[PDB]
Design an enzyme around this catalytic site. Structure first.
Site, mmCIF file in Angstrom:
data_model
loop_
_atom_site.group_PDB
_atom_site.id
_atom_site.type_symbol
_atom_site.label_atom_id
_atom_site.label_comp_id
_atom_site.label_asym_id
_atom_site.label_seq_id
_atom_site.Cartn_x
_atom_site.Cartn_y
_atom_site.Cartn_z
ATOM 1 C CG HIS A 1 -52.007 51.238 49.638
ATOM 2 N ND1 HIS A 1 -51.556 51.850 50.784
ATOM 3 C CD2 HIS A 1 -51.713 49.927 49.766
ATOM 4 C CE1 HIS A 1 -51.009 50.945 51.576
ATOM 5 N NE2 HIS A 1 -51.081 49.771 50.977
ATOM 6 C CB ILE B 1 -51.798 55.928 43.804
ATOM 7 C CG1 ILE B 1 -52.991 55.840 42.799
ATOM 8 C CG2 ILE B 1 -51.183 54.540 44.082
ATOM 9 C CD1 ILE B 1 -52.507 55.585 41.315
ATOM 10 C CB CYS B 2 -50.586 55.430 49.467
ATOM 11 S SG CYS B 2 -49.200 55.219 50.664
ATOM 12 C CG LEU B 3 -46.716 52.446 44.165
ATOM 13 C CD1 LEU B 3 -46.989 51.028 44.668
ATOM 14 C CD2 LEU B 3 -46.913 52.522 42.639
#
Length: 109
Positions: free
Chosen positions: A75, A82-84
């Site tokens: 992520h 950031i993949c969040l």
């Protein structure tokens, strides 16, 4: 105003293994240093997270990404993005910056 409240919160209650710096000429930029927790795959490695507060903060989320080199993680993109969900679709304007950073550390760990 909300940035100052978050600054107090972060300095008083910093995320685990994190320390804060701020840009000397921009109140809207922070740099968080994270030292990888023992017993995780990033143990003792240093990572730096850049945090930018947009003009519409807190209704709009802060922009947060890792400085080079970012942790190698599913992520985290090569550019440190950031993949969040908490930073996007599931953002709540009551989120503390301290809690945001702790969630990232959680994701990494």
């Amino acid at each position: 105003y909300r940035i100052q409240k978050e600054l107090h919160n972060f300095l008083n209650n910093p995320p685990i293994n994190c320390t804060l710096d701020v840009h000397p000429n921009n109140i809207r930029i922070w740099i968080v240093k994270y030292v990888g927790l023992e017993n995780t795959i990033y143990a003792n490695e240093v990572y730096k997270l850049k945090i930018i507060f947009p003009d519409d903060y807190p209704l709009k989320p802060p922009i947060v990404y890792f400085l080079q080199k970012p942790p190698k993680h599913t992520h985290v993109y090569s550019n440190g993005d950031i993949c969040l969900s908490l930073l996007g679709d599931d953002y709540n304007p009551s989120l503390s910056i301290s809690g945001l950073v702790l969630s990232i550390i959680s994701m990494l760990s």
